[PDB]
Amino acid sequence: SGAIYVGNYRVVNRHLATHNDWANLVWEDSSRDLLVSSTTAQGCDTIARCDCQTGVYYCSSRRKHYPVSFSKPSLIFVEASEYYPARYQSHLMLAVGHSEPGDCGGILRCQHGVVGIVSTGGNGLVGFADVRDLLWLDE
Ligand SMILES: N#CCc1ccccc1CC(=O)N1CCC[C@H](C(N)=O)C1
Ligand SMILES: [Zn+2]
């Protein structure tokens, strides 16, 4: 679990969005596993606008942060789950690092701010849904 809070927006994994997120829907994209909802309170986070490929992510299944080298956002095949059929997920970045079911929503950050959130994983890999291209989050 986990979310990004920036301005009057809450960014969460689409498959973990609540009834309240859907009732205050701003934008969603099943192909990216992202959903953005509106909030009444101003948010705590800053979004990176960069092309960093190194950063640090929070891993809830270890209660620890880990450094990672990650691939550029791309179209990656993701196996079927209870949430989605087998499909290509877009804007996804992979890295070697621990992740297990329950770790989605952990933040990945570089020196410029928030880069994205955990969205996939398995076998010593962790995948992050990029948010750096969503320029409208800042206005
Ligand atoms: N961290 C983590 C998740 C994880 C880690 C390790 C093993 C398995 C998983 C679960 C998994 O990859 N997904 C289930 C939920 C929806 C995700 C998607 N974006 O399509 C895919
Ligand atoms: Zn950066």
Side-chain angles (χ1 to χ4, degrees), residues 59-74:
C59 175
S60 61
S61 63
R62 294 285 181 273
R63 296 208 189 98
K64 273 181 183 169
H65 296 259
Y66 293 106
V68 281
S69 286
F70 52 93
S71 64
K72 291 181 132 161
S74 74

